[PDB]
């Protein structure tokens, strides 16, 4: 950092090596769990409301 | 009674007739429950609770 009036932050990353300057890591993927039952809570037991 | 000493209740019964002391009853046996299903509504809205 130098001057004033800081500014926006690029940044140089190689890519050469397997293991990335970052990592996205997760247990799982994307899951949904849409409820589209006649006994689910809120679509006909609660309300009229699919989720 | 007893003015000084109180400190217990010892029983005695006969526990031979037909009866006995304290007879238990029941109507049905004991249910479990385990709401582990995505459709349960805790356990997709409370946090993930299941119970």
Known sequence: ???VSNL???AADPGAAWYLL???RS???LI???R???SFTS???EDDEQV
């Open 1 to 3: 950092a130098t001057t």
């Open 8 to 10: 926006f932050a690029p």
């Open 22 to 24: 970052d990592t996205s």
């Open 27 to 29: 247990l799982k993927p």
């Open 32 to 34: 949904y769990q849409e």
């Open 36 to 38: 589209m039952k006649p």
């Open 43 to 45: 679509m006909t037991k």
